[PDB]
Design a protein around this ligand. Structure first.
Ligand SMILES: OC[C@@H](O)[C@@H](O)CO
Ligand SMILES: OC[C@@H](O)[C@@H](O)CO
Ligand SMILES: [Cl-]
Ligand SMILES: [Cl-]
Ligand SMILES: [Cl-]
Ligand SMILES: [Cl-]
Ligand SMILES: [Cl-]
Ligand SMILES: [Cl-]
Ligand SMILES: [Cl-]
Ligand SMILES: [Cl-]
Lengths: 415, 415
């Protein structure tokens, strides 16, 4: 008769939106779904209290990077049955399928719900005035840096601010997504954060490939293509700066396309110049590959649930095509289920089509039980590198020393 | 020499504000203080990674309810010496002094930084139009409810919305602060969330007095005083609703006073009717006492720091009068150090003086190592009570059964 589901604040009216999403299921099954919205400030510790105590909801949202840890606690019900009903492994991008279980595991313990991915938004008016061909700028790392250098030299002023635009706005260390902002560059240089090599998971942040990609990215800020002020800010603050006409290029997710249609009094930017001058391109091809950061959230069923068959029906509903389209639109995310990408709500919008192009390059972190420790240690040492950038002190050798320290700490944490 | 400090996003420009705060210390000591801003989305797990790895800053911010858990890990340096230098135990409210150590511990492991406390904001225009005397409304629980009854009956319309105001806005279960919103009512009825007997803490949420206070509070929502919409929302959303003229009364912290002085175009609400009609009163006296929720943040020194003497000088500076006044203003919080309350920046503002009145009633949770699990389990079951409120189905008997379930789970966690 009732299911309890915990979600995070994924949409503008989290509880109301989720209740609208599930109303057809409630009517069809004659059950009530009770949703509780967990601040990302408290979600993780509420979810581990549920895991340790055996007292919790039926379903919980998990960040994709949380799946290995909570799975490793032995508290999640297998959901291979749900995933088979939805079309099995080949219904998902490989990157997304990796997030359905603890890394390496035979059985699924999480159902893909929606995907976060990042692509570059750009000011089409700024690139035109700089003489920057958007295709060349996003076809190679040399192209990207050459585009930022032309944007730096440009006399273009934003029509509202009457000031130059920064070529690239990115956070540095003061954001939740420090590693995610770096990951595409690591990967595109042929690197990785961790590798399963020489008979164990170990850091690869100090590999020559990883170092090349990290140095490429962080050196763009040292060369003057990123404002000093951006390095103090988080991702949300950078979004606001791009809305406000301060930034020619920045990475973000699909939600900005919706925000460009929403009035400022409702937290969008439809009244600003940027809303009418918006382009999107995937991350540029690196020397050793081309990768798009994927994250987002999955759903899991606690093994202590008293309602497992009904909760599995609700996972099949939430994971299936109609609800995938609807909730991706409510959240400004991309559906997890690839069949949902053909919906006209995506295909009729050229900017969302470019996000689907970006999705083809998708890559996630390994689903390690100890992922949060790896990421935390990687980000402490990436922040030390961003501190050198902020002072104009980043060199290849100083970066190598920081990633050797990171690698020692990560490798201890993985033992 | 550099010192490293981790903070959370306490002020509108977190990094730049903190750098401004410490610039005098840096000049005095010829040292650079490097700050990293951690989203409350990730600060806890970053601090436990630091604790387990030895890789971390010199100083970290901690929420007050985090002190027991991090102290129990054995990673914090004793700071009795810093606290004596700031005036010792009697420099602080007793509630704030409780947060300097793990409950029952001999040595202090945290230095009070700033205090979060809640009082009731009210629309002076709405109460006048409803014929409600603010002093009588906030002198007793029966006065409080009588005032809400007059506010429900009132034909007053907000001049901008041209709609009635809700008598009382409060979150229900979809907020980070579910227990904190309930705590003053539990305590004012003579109750508590936990009680020590023997060497054992146990739940007191099913105590007669706790039940009386929780039913009083939750039943105001079942009586029509609180909009259904409020019960879907978090504290920030409710703050926005009060700014937008939807709420006659709501509880929050001192930051709203600054927000009322700031234009909307800069993130405040100075253009709105509520900014021009703002009153503040402490929580009303209960039948068995009068208490104000305190939280906030402290600072701690990791025992693996290689700069403990200099870091303790920085704790003395951040803990001391000039920085206490400056930071409490940046954050919109109350200073932890009582001597700072005499500053003109507080005393020249009648609403901040009312917050200082409210502080005399301050109360905190016990500083238990397992606090987060207690609170998490308590909140799971209070959320089930909020769901009965939303249906008009909360009875004293139903609340008792829910709090007995909460108590069983809590008592298991504390064994
Ligand atoms: O026409 C835009 C289209 O080429 C792609 O973005 C879809 O893949
Ligand atoms: O004038 C207001 C003053 O009474 C107090 O708020 C100080 O305590
Ligand atoms: Cl398995
Ligand atoms: Cl990786
Ligand atoms: Cl992948
Ligand atoms: Cl800094
Ligand atoms: Cl001690
Ligand atoms: Cl208590
Ligand atoms: Cl206390
Ligand atoms: Cl009853």
């Amino acid at each position: 008769k009732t299911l309890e589901v915990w979600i995070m604040p994924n949409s503008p009216q989290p509880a109301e939106d989720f209740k609208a999403l599930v109303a057809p299921f409630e009517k069809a099954h004659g059950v009530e779904v009770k949703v509780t919205v967990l601040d990302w400030g408290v979600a993780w510790t509420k979810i581990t209290t549920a895991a340790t105590s055996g007292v919790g909801p039926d379903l919980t949202q998990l960040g994709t990077t949380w799946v290995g840890a909570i799975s490793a606690m032995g508290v999640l019900e297998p959901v291979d049955d749900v995933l088979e009903a939805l079309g099995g492994e080949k219904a998902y991008l490989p990157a997304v399928w990796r997030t359905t279980r603890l890394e390496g595991a035979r059985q699924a313990t999480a159902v893909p719900w929606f995907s976060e991915l990042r692509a570059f938004y750009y000011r089409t008016d700024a690139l035109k005035a700089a003489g920057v061909n958007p295709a060349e700028m996003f076809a190679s790392w040399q192209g990207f840096e050459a585009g930022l250098a032309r944007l730096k030299a440009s006399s273009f002023r934003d029509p509202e601010t009457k000031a130059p635009l920064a070529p690239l706005c990115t956070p540095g260390k003061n954001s939740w997504d420090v590693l995610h902002n770096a990951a595409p560059w690591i990967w595109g240089a042929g690197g990785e954060i961790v590798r399963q090599a020489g008979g164990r998971w170990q850091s690869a942040l100090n590999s020559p490939e990883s170092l090349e990609g990290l140095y490429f990215f962080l050196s763009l800020a040292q060369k003057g293509y990123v404002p000093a002020e951006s390095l103090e800010k988080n991702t949300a603050q950078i979004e606001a700066d791009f809305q406000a006409g301060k930034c020619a290029v920045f990475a973000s997710g699909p939600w900005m396309i919706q925000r460009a249609q929403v009035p400022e009094a409702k937290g969008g930017f439809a009244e600003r110049t940027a809303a009418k001058n918006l382009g999107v391109a995937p991350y540029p091809a690196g020397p050793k590959g081309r990768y798009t950061f994927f994250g987002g959230s999955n759903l899991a069923l606690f093994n202590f649930s008293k309602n497992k068959p009904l909760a599995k029906e609700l996972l099949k509903y939430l994971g299936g095509p109609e609800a995938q389209v609807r909730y991706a639109q409510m959240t400004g995310m991309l559906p997890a289920l690839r069949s949902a990408w053909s919906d006209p709500s995506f295909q009729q919008n050229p900017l969302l089509r470019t996000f689907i192009q970006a999705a083809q390059f998708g890559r996630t972190y390994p689903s390690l039980a100890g992922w949060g420790g790896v990421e935390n240690l990687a980000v402490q040492h990436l922040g030390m590198a961003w501190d050198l950038v902020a002072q104009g002190r980043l060199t290849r050798e100083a970066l190598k020393d920081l990633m050797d320290k990171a690698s020692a700490a990560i490798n201890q944490a993985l033992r």
